[model samples]
Structure formats: C-alpha cells, structure tokens
Target chain A: AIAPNTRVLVAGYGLPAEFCVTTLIGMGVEIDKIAVATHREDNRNCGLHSMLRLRNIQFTTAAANSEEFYEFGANFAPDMIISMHYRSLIPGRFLKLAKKGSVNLHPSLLPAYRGTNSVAWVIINGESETGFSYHRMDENADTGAILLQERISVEETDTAFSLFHRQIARAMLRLEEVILKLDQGDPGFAQLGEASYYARELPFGGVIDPRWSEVQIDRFIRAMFFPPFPPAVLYYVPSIDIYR
Target chain B: AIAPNTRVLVAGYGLPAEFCVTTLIGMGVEIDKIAVATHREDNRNCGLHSMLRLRNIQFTTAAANSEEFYEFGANFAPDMIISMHYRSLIPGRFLKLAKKGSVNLHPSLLPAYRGTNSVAWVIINGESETGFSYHRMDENADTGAILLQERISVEETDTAFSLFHRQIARAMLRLEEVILKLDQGDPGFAQLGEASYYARELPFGGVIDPRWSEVQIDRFIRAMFFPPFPPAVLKIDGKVYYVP
Candidate 1:
C-alpha cells in the first residue's frame, strides 16, 4: 500500500509513460506524491505532459546535464523512481534521491534484446514470445534484476507498431499489481544468463534482404512496419532475386 | 570533530577540487570516508581523478548522466557534500543523500556574477578585490546561504586564469579551517541582496572592443586571456585581430 506520503518520481515520455503514471495515480496514490521528469522539447505533445498539466502537477523539463536537477530534484526527494520510456538515462544523483531506489520498465524480457529498438528487435529476432520486465536499474542498460515479467505472445500477423501497442496495452493491465508488489518490499532477482542487444540503428539499416527466406523476409518487413515513418521495401527482379 | 566515519562526498574537478578533497583527507579523515564524483570522458585527464588514482581512491564517474552515481553514491551515503569546481550540478536527490547537507565553493562573492564565468566576470568588472565563498547550494544558482567568504585583493596584472588560480590559492589556505568549522556545526547564513548572472558565453561573446579606453581594453584582454587558448579579437569587418 503506497501512503500519500511516499514520494515517487516518474521519468517518462509519450503514451506508455502517460499510461504508467495514470495507473499509479488511479491506484489511489495521491497525485501530489508523483513528480514527472519530462523533456523540454515537444512537451506540449507528450501524453504524460498533457495529463500532468491539468492537475497542477509538478513536472521537470530539466536536461540530464543541467544544474536544474539539483535545485528541482532536491525539493522532491523521491522514495522511488520509475523510468517509463524516458529517453534520457537517469543520473545516479537522481537515483539516490529515491529512498527505496529506482526501477525501469523495459518492453523486452531481461537478458534478451536489451537496448533501444526492443520491440522492433524482438520481431526481427523471431522471438515468438516477447514481454515486459520490471527490474531494478543497474549501471548496464536493461541488465538489472528482474522484479517480475509478464509474457505477451507475438502474433505472426503483428507489425512493429501493432506489437508495440499490444505490449503497452498488456502493461497497463499488469502495472497496478506490480506497483503494489513494489510497495510491499518485493526484492527482485538478478537477471539470468547472457544478454543480447541491438543498437539504436536497425540491422543493415532495415534494408529488405532478398537472400532471406520467405518467413524471414516477412518477419523483417513486419519488424520495420512502423507507420508515418517509412519502412524500406524489397526490390527484386522477376527472373532472379536481387535486394536493393 | 570530523569522525573517520562521517562520510563526505566531494563533487570536484581540477586543482581546486584536488585541493579541497586533499584538505578534508589531510585533516585526519580516512581515505575510505571520502568519495569523489568526477567527469567521465576526461577522467584520465582531470586533476582530482588523477589524485584519487594515486591514492587508489573511490570515485563515481562513467556516464555523464549515469547509473554509477546510484551504486557509488548509495554505498557512500555522504554525510556532507562539498562541490569544488565540479562541472555537474549536484541534483536535489544527491543533496538529500547528505545528512549534513551540501556546500559549494564559488570564486565570486555571492549575489554577483551568479554563473559559469564568475572569475572572468570579476576581472571584466575591474573590481579591486574579489574572494571565495563557501555556501549551501540552494535550488537557484549561487543563491544559497553563506557559510563564509574570504576576501583577497585582485592584482592589476591578473588574467582570467591567473585570477582563477589566485582564488583557488586563497581557498586552499582556508580549506582546512573551514572543514573544521563545518564539522563543528556551522549553519550557513542566507545570502543578502539581489543576484546578478552571466552565461557560459562572455559579454559580447569575448570579442575585444577597440572603442574603449586603454584601461578598459587592458582589462578586457586580460579578462579574456588564458594560455593555450586564444581569446577573440577586435572584430573589424570580417577580420579577427588576435595576437600571440
């Protein structure tokens, strides 16, 4: 049970962050108990920022490099910090403010597909099952101990954007229970096995590989299928397969 | 009496921080009782970093905005934090970690030149005397309470770097005594009077103006002059007149 007095800071971005913060507040955590760290750029369009605005909510647009963190972060003195789709890495100084420590919500299961492009990479890796992990944040990206993970199936028909939305949807369903678990002193376990990672860039720059099998080609195209942003196409001649 | 167990986190850079941390350790505080927070990209090159390296010192630095801060910072759990020419802002969370609170060593007198170019601005202001102030770090820039300020005469021949070095020299002389005072419970006083500030950029972008009298020109050039780095020139048409 989170008391009204328990201070929590959520460093978040966009819709998933909005969902996470709202879930926390909806679970009877006092609105005042939350502080959001958001980006200064395009704040007007950020889902979390928009929701926070109407509630007289306190939010920080301070850059990770700015001195403003001390002045602003000092006042909040959070017990826990939840990193929700935040692009900026949370500094240890900011993490120290959390009396109970900090955790991150990464879309992929621990020890697999770590780093940026988690959702997209999972599809490319042909991981039939991908899920979310709530874990303590360690120095390494997405290598923290696992608090809990909720598995969500990857459908054959799913595109990158569709699976991304699906993961967010499932996360919302489980977030409340996880928050409750975290409050009750549920210590998480160390991540298992070796890890795999993908950089911010897609493999081979997301160019369609004609050499890949039909199933592999299907997976790559689906993995790249994010809307509004262009995904590469396969260019092949009828007589012989040529990837361009 | 400053106990060996009174853990102090020193966020520092360069020679001044080296002096500040050395003073604290020299006054009978054990090496393990102190942790330094330093820069990452240039750790091999920073003075404090090298000093700690010599002592097999404990430090927190990796990512500029990193998770190392939590692991290192959480472990040390500083009773007091002293900022000595540290480039990073001490986040409120890091400040909250300190039981005795946080303090910063600034070259300028408070309520004046409240920013990056403090030493340079003082020379540009042509003040006869300027000093060092150790103050609690408040949310705003250099607006915190004064622990104490030690004044020193600014010599006529001083360049920005020389004046900065002089301030550091004065600080070293007073560092030991101040640490002793801080240990025995020194509640610093709130700053009096209004505040003024300058940016990382110099006044008029450090382009020497030839319109001023020889006295002002001398001050401007000296204020801008730092060895190995060429100060900008009197911008005439498109030509920059910089002399060795």
Candidate 2:
C-alpha cells in the first residue's frame, strides 16, 4: 500500500525528533541512515545508540557541528533529510549532501508563525486556530515551501503541554502523507508569500502586565502555557497565578 | 447640615437632565437662579420653566448660542455649575463664568478614562473597579483637576442600566465631599500626570472575530461588557439568516 526502499534521512535528537525517526521507519520507507546530533557528549554516547537499537533504526551519533555528518550523508546519499523537533540548526553544507532537499516540521500554519515556540505565542496572543506544517527547508529559517498543513481548534483550557501533545500526534499522523506527496512529485506546494517571525527571548516566555486589558492578559496566558516551560505568569496578582 | 445658598446652576438636558436639577435642588444648595437648556422645542417652551416654578426656583428657558452662553456666565455668575447628563459642549467662555469654574459629575475616574462612554468601556475592557469623579472642567474635555472620586465594584451580571444607576448614586453621595473640598480651597485635590484616552471606536466594542482564540474572544467580551452601554454582541456563524 506504500512506497518501499525510499531512502530517507532523519535528524533524531528530541522527543518529536525521535518520533519522526520512528514514524519514518514504520512507514514502508527505507531509511538510508539517521544522524543523531547532540550537544552533550554523554547523550551522544548513550542516548543515540539506545534509541536506534530500540527502534531497529540504523543511526550514528556525532557532535552537532561534526564534519563527519556531512561526509556520511554525502556517501549515504539520503533521498530526503527530514527534521522533526531537531534542536540544532542544520548547516547548509549537510543539507546539500542529501540527494533530495530537507524537510522541517513546525507546529503552526506557515507564513504566520514559523519558529521555536509558535504554539505558545499563538495561544498567548489568543489566536483561535493553530496547526502543523511540513515544508521544504531553504536557506532562510522556517521559510521553506510548504508541503502539507492541517489545523486544530484552540480550546479555552488548553495549556502548552496539552497543545503540544496534540501537535505531535498530528505531525506523526500527517508525516507519511507529506512524504507520499513528495514521492509522487506533487507540485502543489508553494513558497510562503507573507510571513512573520518569532524569536526566543527571556520576556517572551513568562510575562504578564497588570492594568493590561483582560484581552491582553488572556493572550499572555494562552501563549505562555507549554510543557518544559511553565504557564504564562502573573507574579503581582495573586488570583490565577498558575493558570493554564 | 450642609452649607446654604451656594448659588448653584443645574444645566439640565438629555435623558436624565431634569433629574440632575432636582437632585441638586434637593441637596439644599442655594439657588440664586436656574437655567434649563432643553434639546426639544416643546420641552424648552413648556416643561422646564413650569417644573422650576413648582419648586419656587426662578427659571429661564435661555437658548444661548455657544458664544452667548459663555458671555451669560460672566453676567449671571453662579458659584457652581453641576452638569449631570448634560450633552451640550459648554464652551471655554462659559467654563470661566463660575466662581469655582464648573464641576462635572462624570461616571468615570479622572486623569484616566475621560470620555462619554466611560462606564461601558471600562466594563468592556474587563476592568474590575470603576468610579465617578467630580472634576473642575478645564478647556480640555474631562481633563479637569480632580475634586473627589468614589469607586464602585462591578459585578459579573451588571448591565449598562444597572451600572448607570450605581454610578449616579455613588457620584451623588460623594458630591457633598467634593463641594467641601472646593469650599476649603485645597490645591491637593488637583489630578496629577497625563491621562489615558479612549477612542470612539474601541477594538473590544466592535465586531467579534470568530476565528479569534478564546483569550481574544474573552478580551473582546470584557471590553464590550463594561457598563453604561448595551451588552456586547456578535453574530453567530450560520445563524445570520434566522431571527432571534
């Protein structure tokens, strides 16, 4: 029912990153290899191999900046470089080594929010709908041409954790569809026209201002709640300090 | 007992203008003369002077042009002009006519939120505390130095009508204190700093965006619900054709 031996390359490092690798392997795609990029040597030595062994995936560990990564991908000649929740920036040199272009997964509708904490920012800003997009990676960050996108409703009580989990599951379900379109040479994907970017900052994470209108406060709370990060905070007001 | 024969002018007009004149008269402020500025020709011709005659107060159905009204202040020189629901723009010429200038019973705190729809806007913006201030009217609108202010709590169920009544009572109760301060010649009663301004077209008071996040919706609702205006509204999707 699916394409076989379609050599794919995945950058497996974080949770969504690991899920991407597992999901690709489960699809009938022949994963040529995986490069498990890590900043910490301890994680490089133990975590990478254990993940590959458990998932029956053939992968190698390397420091994020190692040149061996470039050489391996060149020799392995992966058909596509797929990144999901990959923490580090993929050097352009390694991207060129793959036979086909790289793909990146983001938890937001493209051209709107295209960065690390899109879900958090959208919720904090009190936006209504949010979704995931897979795009063909280009030189600019999150500016890749879109391959696929799907939307989900933002519930009132949704915290960052719940929202993120929802994104991950959706990403997993849709990854195969994106790959199929790419394999079939579907040319519907287009380059993003108008886009806004969000950068990581200290205040962007957890901040609330008193005397702000309730709407303003609502945006702050919705965007700030996420896993690994505490919910948007209001240190001054005692009521609803740790709300979702 | 309160001070007697204060030479008060109750400039009554609009919906509750007559009530304002009655309230001041009931408070025992000495009435040297009364001027009834009615918006309607019938009301101007018959209703106002008769009401003043019944109360044994001298009345004039004076139709002063913007310039003449200001000039009239110089001639008829009253101690105070207490404007309740008066909508006419009392010119700067008239503003200088009173001994203590004029003290307006605005249903909002001074040096902040100075405007016509203050009560509704405050609730629409989801403010928890709201108050009325009696301020000496300057050339600038509602930017007058503060005489006295009384705050009232806004319950969740408060509508424009209920909020107006509450504000009126609070403003009335504090009128005595305001007069006392003005009589004592207290410079400390003046308001400090630049004030916040609200526009006629506030974001929260307008049409609701259905795609807006819950936080966004909540913010808009809060801004719309603030008192002295009707409840905030939105057209439900797919139900536009049906009558409710």
Candidate 3:
C-alpha cells in the first residue's frame, strides 16, 4: 500500500540491499525518488553497487556519520529509509529526515540472533529453525519492533554460506510484505523477551577437547566448515588417541 | 655389540614396541632369551601382538606394578629391558632385574617435547625440526638420561599421521644406534635443560579466534586436521566480520 509518490531511501550493503532495492523498483517506486547510500568501506565492486550502476540508479558512498552522508539525507528528504545489512549506524539526524521513519531487514527472527554471525552460531548450537525479521529501526542494532517474520527449517548440512543464500531469498519476500504493511500505516509490534547479542570478540580457540559429546563435535564441524575459514579443530590428547 | 646371548625384555606398545623387538632379533639376540611385556591396556590384537605370535615369541601383559608382572620380570631375568612407547612405569625392583638397566626410545629429543602426543604438539606449535632421543628410563616418564639422539625436519605439509610414520621410521634407526652404544658399555649422558611436558588433559576447546595471525591460523589448521579428531575451527565475530 505504499503511496505512489512516497520517496524511499535504501541504505546498506550485500545481498539484503540488493534484494530490497530490486523489490522496490519492481513495486513501481520511481527510480529518481529512490536513493541509495552504502558504507564507504564496502567493496566498490560488490553486487549491490554493480546492480545499481547497471540500472542507472544513483547511489552515494560515505562513512555513515560523515557530513556528506547527513547532507545527502537532508537533500533526499525521504518518506522512508530501509537498512539492509549495513555496516554503519544511521545517525539520529539522518534518521529524522525520513518522514515515515526507518526500518531494517535483519537476517534472523527479532529478539533472537540479534547480532552478527547469527546464522553460524545458530547452526553451531544445532537449532532446528530460524528466520528473517523486518522491523522498525532503532538506534540500536536489530532492536527494532517487528513488522514481519518468516521461519525456515535449518537442514543438517546447512553451513553459513548456504544459509546466507536461503535467508536472502526469504528476505526478498519479507521485505515486500513489510513495505505493504508500512504503506497501509501499520506500526510494528515491539521486540519481546531478554535479548542476546553475540559479540564479535567471543572467545574461540578451535581446540577440540575430548569432553565435548560426539553430537556436539559433529555440529561444530558442520557449523565451522565454511570455506576460506578454518573448520572445527580437534586437539590431540594422548590418553584418548588410541581409544577415540 | 649387543651380546649374542643377551636376554632382552622388550616392553611397550605400537610402533616403538614393534621396532625394538624386531631390531633386537635382527641384531642376533637369541629369540628364546627375548621376551615382550606390554601394558594390559595395549590392544591384544594389534600388529605387535600378531607379529609376536607369528615369531613364536613369548609375551606377557600386566599393570606395571602388579605382583604377577614383577614375578615375571624376576623370573625372566632380562640382561636388558627396552621400553618403546610403554605406558606403565617400571618399578625400581623390575629395573634391578635387568642387568644392563632399562632404556627408552622417546619420539622427540629429550628434555623437549617430553610427554605424550609430542609429535602432534611439535607440528601444532609449528616447529621446523624435531627428532628421536633414546634414553635411560628412571622413575619418571620421558625424564631419562640421553643415550643417543638424532634430529629430523618437520615438513610443512606433515600432519600428525604423516609425521608419525616418519618419526617411527627414524625411531627404528635410532634404536639400532642406541642398542649398539649400550652394548659397547656406554652408560649414556644425563638429560639437560628444562623439560616441557604436555599433559593428556591439556586445555583445548577448538574455537578459532580472529585475533590469531594468518601464520598461526595456518599452522593450527595443519596441526588439528588429523582424522577421527575434528579440524581447526574459525568462530564468527560480529565486530570482526563487518570491519575485518
């Protein structure tokens, strides 16, 4: 139910940003009315950047807090802002420029999997299901009120790489629904329960101790086997070597 | 110069035991005067057991301190005892039964990599060189006087499994030299330097941290990638991800 004249600003990086922008264009949002901002540190040749260029869509890159970014937001005067896998936070001043407020598409169900590497951690912990959440954006990360969420089963063989693609596909559909709900003036529900944040500096040495169960070892292997990163490690303990 | 009629008692398990007994026979020690003793915990159906049976060699298994083991050692009256990878410590009384005292073949140079899984730890620690030390067995594990020592390089591509085979082969050669030296009345030299013992219960949880350097991470991957044990793992960190 987005108004035909509603101006939208898309900000962020990676597949989520790609999906959001493509969906908006498909939904008839005027190319000129849609503006894109990405982190300056994001790969200049990333898919989102390439897609925007291919479509002749205008986009800008800057540090999220830079004056240039703030000036761009002031000039765009967006009716709404959408964040998708963005590295930097939208400052209060820039957030205020959007008339209908800002929303984010986090790759996990809200209130859980609230931080980075959520998919990997979920798989490592052997969860059976996880999903995507589209929510209102707050100053904090993934703390927004939930607008829409859809769950998917986690296969036994799912690695972070596979899950990334699966979540992005679901995100495309979820974003469409969220946009419609927002156009109809629906405000999302507040996040519930005690939130857990998986910090980037969590302790991990990858030395497998014999104390862990076989099932846990298996799960750990699957979770950490994604290429380019080392796989789950098992240390040599002499007492257990011959028996194990 | 091992006396042709020397009554030798071979004690230990796995490759070390296999190498010692076979080499003793090849060196002309009378088969009837040679006996084998292994830990009760050593696999009865292992290669060493099968080889002993094939050669009609008499062997016994017991806890090192058991009355039956002590009685057997006293009755056999070995001129010398050779320990290769034996788990149980020889009681001082049993040592007295061997006229030439007991000698041990450790997989690494004495006073360094002094305990179990030393080869694996060497690779895990990224050591460029490691070797064998044949030494006199006293009351402690791998704290014996150095009888003969030899060095070998740890190849960049060596896993615990590969290094194991390499070390065992070198061990056979070193064992021959140690026996020769012992036969010629060489009592060996006392071990020097601070010993580093890796315990069976060393702390390892297999959670790869991002803080590790690329070199350390690479070495860790090679060290922990042995089969039946899990591989080295890389943990996902939220802060490190978007930034790194």
Q: Who wins the TM-score comparison?
A: 1
Compare candidates 2 and 3 on TM-score and give the better one: 3
**lDDT head-to-head 2 vs 3, winner:** 3
Taking all chains together, each candidate's TM-score versus the true structure is: 0.48, 0.44, 0.47
* Residue-wise C-alpha lDDT for candidate 2, range B44-159, written one tens digit per residue: 12334344544455444445455455555566667767666556667776766667567777887777777766766666566777888877777767877777777778755444
**Candidate 1 wrong stretches, greater than 4 Å:** A1-244, B41-45, B63-65
Candidates' lDDT values, in order?
0.70, 0.59, 0.70
Q: Order of candidates by lDDT, top first?
A: 3, 1, 2
Per-residue lDDT of candidate 3, residues A138-218 (tens digit): 777788788888987887656664566466554654566787886776788999976777866322554555577876666
Count of clashing residue pairs in every prediction: 4, 19, 13
Worst 10 residues of 3 chain B by lDDT: B235-244
The DockQ of predicted model 3 stands at 0.01
The better candidate by TM-score, 1 or 3, is 1
Give the range where candidate 1 chain B is weakest over 10 consecutive residues by summed lDDT.
B41-50
Candidate 3 Cα errors over 4 Å, as ranges: A40-45, A235-244, B1-244
User: How well does candidate 3 match the true structure in TM-score terms?
Assistant: 0.47
Q: In model 2, what is chain B's TM-score?
A: 0.74
Candidate 2 lDDT at B133 equals 82
